[PDB]
Amino acid sequence: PGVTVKDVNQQEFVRALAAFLKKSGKLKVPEWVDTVKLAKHKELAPYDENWFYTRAASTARHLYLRGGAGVGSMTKIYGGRQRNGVMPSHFSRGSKSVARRVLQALEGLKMVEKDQDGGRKLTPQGQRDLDRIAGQVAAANKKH
Amino acid sequence: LVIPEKFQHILRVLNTNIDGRRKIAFAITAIKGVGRRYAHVVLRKADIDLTKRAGELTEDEVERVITIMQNPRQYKIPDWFLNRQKDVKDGKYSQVLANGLDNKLREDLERLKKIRAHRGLRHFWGLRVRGQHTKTTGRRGRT
Amino acid sequence: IHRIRITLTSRNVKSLEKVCADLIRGAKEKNLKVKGPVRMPTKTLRITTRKTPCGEGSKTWDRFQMRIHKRLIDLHSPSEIVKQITSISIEPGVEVEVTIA
Amino acid sequence: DKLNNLVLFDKATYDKLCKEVPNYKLITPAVVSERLKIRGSLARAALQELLSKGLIKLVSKHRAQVIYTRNT
Amino acid sequence: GHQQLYWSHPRKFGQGSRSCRVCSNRHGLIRKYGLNMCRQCFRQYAKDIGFIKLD
Amino acid sequence: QSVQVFGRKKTATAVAHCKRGNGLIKVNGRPLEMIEPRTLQYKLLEPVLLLGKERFAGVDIRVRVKGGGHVAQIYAIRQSISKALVAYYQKYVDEASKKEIKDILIQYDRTLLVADPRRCESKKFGGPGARARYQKSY
Amino acid sequence: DIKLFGKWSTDDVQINDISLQDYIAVKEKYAKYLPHSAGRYAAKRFRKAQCPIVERLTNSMMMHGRNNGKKLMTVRIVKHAFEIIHLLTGENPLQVLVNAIINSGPREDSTRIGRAGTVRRQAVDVSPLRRVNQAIWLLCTGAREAAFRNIKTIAECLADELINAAKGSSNSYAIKKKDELERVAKSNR
RNA sequence: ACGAGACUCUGGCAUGCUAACUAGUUACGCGACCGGUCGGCGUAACUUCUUAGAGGGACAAGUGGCGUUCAGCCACCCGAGAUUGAGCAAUAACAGGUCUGUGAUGCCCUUAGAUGUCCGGGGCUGCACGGCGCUACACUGACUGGCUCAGCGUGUGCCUACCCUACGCCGGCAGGCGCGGGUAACCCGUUGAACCCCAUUCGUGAUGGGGAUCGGGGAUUGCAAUUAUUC
């Protein structure tokens, strides 16, 4: 029996979800974490080894803080202000291909949602599922 | 932790140069096949423990990453950290070993000298092959 | 259909406000609902050019600014009254686009 | 010279972390541990790790002029 | 020569494809906002076109 | 419920939506107690909890100030706390309580609520910045 | 009342000199719960001359212009000066700050001679406001001289900064420059 | 009388905009949860941020001191505001610059690869940080365990093909292909304008304050990239 998402700590929710999935170890160890640049703007990419769960939950929070957000601000919030090379480099592509191939495997686990209209929204059924996940991570690691 | 015997200060592991005073991302980089993102990807693909320290290292650990450096094609990663990538003398990314035979070992530079390649002439000096507009230029190559 | 958008624009804000008041008063005089004058951000066209016609002299520039003020007003009314109000001999310097959505 | 340093945690880094350092009016292990000529940063790291056994979550490091515990 | 040697490659885009719309001058043109004048002609006509010095 | 006092520091975009409940401030999903900067925590938590924890249970406020910068949403949260409390106790308690709570919130802050029109200033031709020129004349 | 937790108090400051009532403003209504609350003293007609000691410490330490960018850092170093001096001394950090700066610092600081002077200085009776403020300036610049660019482990550098500023060790460069200033002050005597 | 000031534009100030589908929303019809996804028809009152988009006032219904008690100046006890930055900028002058901006113009030349078409190559580049924009021998500094972000202004076919680009694939990527949006607060876009605990992680700091730059999936919507948009 959890509580609504409005008074739920979103960062604590995603971190509890990630910690619970790490301690469970139910899925395989992902090895595509840093085989790539992971976008144009990373000299040395993340090395969490739960970048799968952590970044999926970060994309989920990006989804829910405003349902219906255009893709691209995802790397405005998580990504930094790039300083690539001798030349000045601006806002442009990341590493999309490996992200899409990883999403093709993530689909079915109800972690990051792709809809039939394209984009994102509140998704009442999805909202119920995420609230239940938050409720069951309410008794997860940290906050103890 | 330290034990009452010889710490891994100065030893000949792979004829490389490293002294146990600079910390991680610098000690691993001392070997030209380990460091930065390549170290990250190797530590991922091999599923290695994060806690392990290089203060009292074992030769096998560095050797295994070096073997991966020789053959990174299977891993689908850039075979970087090689000056010999897609260059003559290796049918496929091969490892040349030993020192004191640098001219033979790096015959790539001899091939660049015998073809008198300005690109090859760049190596041995610190300067831009392009050569920018007359200004603070030329100073690149100070011995 | 009761969805009509009128776009008002001008460089001079006095004429813009006067014509907006004209449209609002015309709509509200007869029994009719009308939305408030949505006030879109002003567009500041900036152009900087050297004052001199040659190469000699201190580098002094001219910063010509041009302010475009545009508003959008909604209308839920029959098209006849809209057409009557639009042809009311608006004040000069104002560009109007009446759209029947 | 080529001063002898030890790259990882050590007994000296573990040395006198709770014997006489926290039994002084000034509870600051920095300079006193520095007197051992062994890296003080990792001494601080070991002290923080032993302080964060799991009872109270202490993961923040903050700046250099950072507080330490009171255990006198 | 008149139509046999020239006009065999794309060259319709150079600086010679533009000129000031007041004096047919190709130097110091203004492309911004499409008024297509040189510096000095625009400075002359700025008051009339609608550009006023306020900044 | 309308109090019409807001909280606005610098240019941060803020909302103060009032309806009875506990007084909580949500910042990046982090409530008032656990805050985003994680280093200015005491300076914001000191005035309210040392007097009472049920003190904010009067009227709940959606405070979702999408503030970027620590000086932006920090001290904006306390601006919101003081303004909401003062307006609620103004309109809906009585004048004497108005006077005493205004006295305590003014010994909280003498006169620094509202500022003058200023920000980062413009750049002039002939130099790289606002007040700077090209090579020097010694 | 308002205090620091259930273990520390802030009403332990009484000097009673009857001379800090003209520039150090504690008289009527200048009290704050807040160490600093976004002052607008610039826009005022030089209404910034009744400034307390904590804000002097806040605004008189940075070297060059290599700290500005976020006043977050200013307020954080105020908070961590609070806490670190509290840890050093076990009592009110501001009280011991005053105690350890008054017993030392400028007795007759640097001030010129007549209409123009750069050869020597004058042993000048330093006003209590300016003596206290410049002693806090001495501590701040000594903190950015010792804690910064230190060859030792930095978690006791405020202790050694206190030692240099009050006890008089021959470590800080600012303290030996002030020693030369004191040599001039005695040259006046 | 002109100039100065006043004047205009511009800046961390407004609880009226009988105000807004771009921005949340008093009483509808969604709704786990200790009057909310009514910003997912659309609140006819809205408005608080946003529109700095339109209408406003408040340095003297002030105090102390100095000053001829005047003009003024220096500090502050009912108190948002107590020198923002620019524009304009006089009389008289310069043998100052421009006839290579000009359908704004005085005083001119005459006869063959005429300054206008054809010049693969190429003009300052034959150049050593005592002319703009660059290195902090360091907890004030680190690669997202931290961002519900602080933030000028451009963008397509009327002469005229040549604009801004989201999203998939070639992809682990320059560059290429495809349907799509945008005449613009409507699409690029919540513009990737710092990463504050800073989950490779600093002891006497040649060694994160270069890496004195040419090898590598493969290198351009434009004839020419040889000192140059290659990335």
From Swiss-Prot, chain A:
Changing residue 61 to Q: In DBA1; affects assembly into a functional ribosomal subunit. GO terms for molecular function: fibroblast growth factor binding; identical protein binding; protein kinase binding; RNA binding; structural constituent of ribosome. The modification Omega-N-methylarginine is found at residue 66. Signal peptide: none annotated. It is found in: Cytoplasm; Nucleus, Nucleolus. Changing residue 100 to H: In DBA1; increased protein degradation; affects assembly into a functional ribosomal subunit. The modification N6-acetyllysine is found at residues 22, 110, 114. SUPFAM superfamilies: Winged helix' DNA-binding domain. Its main location: cytoplasm. SMART domains: Ribosomal_S19e. Gene3D superfamilies: Winged helix-like DNA-binding domain superfamily/Winged helix DNA-binding domain. The keyword rRNA processing does not apply. GO terms for biological process: antimicrobial humoral immune response mediated by antimicrobial peptide; cytoplasmic translation; defense response to Gram-negative bacterium; erythrocyte differentiation; killing of cells of another organism; maturation of SSU-rRNA; maturation of SSU-rRNA from tricistronic rRNA transcript (SSU-rRNA, 5.8S rRNA, LSU-rRNA); monocyte chemotaxis. Component of the small ribosomal subunit. The ribosome is a large ribonucleoprotein complex responsible for the synthesis of proteins in the cell. Required for pre-rRNA processing and maturation of 40S ribosomal subunits. Part of the small subunit (SSU) processome, first precursor of the small eukaryotic ribosomal subunit. PANTHER family: 40S RIBOSOMAL PROTEIN S19 (PTHR11710:SF0). This is Small ribosomal subunit protein eS19. It comes from Homo sapiens. The gene is RPS19.
Swiss-Prot record, chain B:
Component of the small ribosomal subunit. The ribosome is a large ribonucleoprotein complex responsible for the synthesis of proteins in the cell. NCBIfam families: PRK04053.1. There is a cross-link at residues 89, 92, 104 (Glycyl lysine isopeptide (Lys-Gly) (interchain with G-Cter in SUMO2)). InterPro entries: Rbsml_uS13_C, Ribosomal_uS13, Ribosomal_uS13-like_H2TH, Ribosomal_uS13_CS. It holds the Pfam family Ribosomal_S13. The lineage of its organism: Eukaryota, Metazoa, Chordata, Craniata, Vertebrata. This is Small ribosomal subunit protein uS13. Component of the small ribosomal subunit. PROSITE patterns: RIBOSOMAL_S13_1 (PS00646), RIBOSOMAL_S13_2 (PS50159). It comes from Homo sapiens (Human). Belongs to the universal ribosomal protein uS13 family. Keywords: Acetylation, Cytoplasm, Isopeptide bond, Ribonucleoprotein, Ribosomal protein, RNA-binding, rRNA-binding, Ubl conjugation.
From Swiss-Prot, chain C:
It comes from the Eukaryota. GO terms for cellular component: cytoplasm; cytosol; cytosolic ribosome; cytosolic small ribosomal subunit; extracellular exosome; membrane; nucleoplasm; synapse. One of its GO terms (molecular function) is RNA binding. The modification Phosphoserine is found at residue 77. One of its GO terms (biological process) is cytoplasmic translation. The modification N6-acetyllysine is found at residues 18, 59. Polyubiquitinated by ZNF598 via 'Lys-63'-linked ubiquitin chains when a ribosome has stalled, initiating the ribosome quality control (RQC) pathway to degrade the potentially detrimental aberrant nascent polypeptide. Deubiquitinated by OTUD3 and USP21, antagonizing ZNF598 activity. Keywords: Acetylation, Cytoplasm, Isopeptide bond, Phosphoprotein, Ribonucleoprotein, Ribosomal protein, Ubl conjugation. It is found in: Cytoplasm. Component of the small ribosomal subunit. The ribosome is a large ribonucleoprotein complex responsible for the synthesis of proteins in the cell. Component of the 40S small ribosomal subunit. Belongs to the universal ribosomal protein uS10 family. This is Small ribosomal subunit protein uS10. The lineage of its organism: Eukaryota, Metazoa, Chordata, Craniata, Vertebrata. The gene is RPS20. The chain holds residues 17 to 117 of 119 of the full protein.
UniProtKB/Swiss-Prot annotation, chain F:
The modification N6-acetyllysine is found at residue 53. It is found in: Cytoplasm; Nucleus, Nucleolus. Keywords: Acetylation, Cytoplasm, Nucleus, Phosphoprotein, Ribonucleoprotein, Ribosomal protein. Disulfide bonds: none annotated. Its main location: cytoplasm. GO terms for biological process: cellular response to leukemia inhibitory factor; cytoplasmic translation; maturation of SSU-rRNA from tricistronic rRNA transcript (SSU-rRNA, 5.8S rRNA, LSU-rRNA); ribosomal small subunit biogenesis; rRNA processing; translation. SUPFAM superfamilies: Ribosomal protein S5 domain 2-like. GO terms for molecular function: RNA binding; structural constituent of ribosome. GO terms for cellular component: cytoplasm; cytosol; cytosolic ribosome; cytosolic small ribosomal subunit; extracellular exosome; focal adhesion; membrane; nucleolus. Pfam families: Ribosomal_S9. Belongs to the universal ribosomal protein uS9 family. PANTHER family: RIBOSOMAL PROTEIN S16, RIBOSOMAL PROTEIN S9. Component of the small ribosomal subunit. Part of the small subunit (SSU) processome, composed of more than 70 proteins and the RNA chaperone small nucleolar RNA (snoRNA) U3. This is Small ribosomal subunit protein uS9. It comes from Homo sapiens (Human). The lineage of its organism: Eukaryota, Metazoa, Chordata, Craniata, Vertebrata.
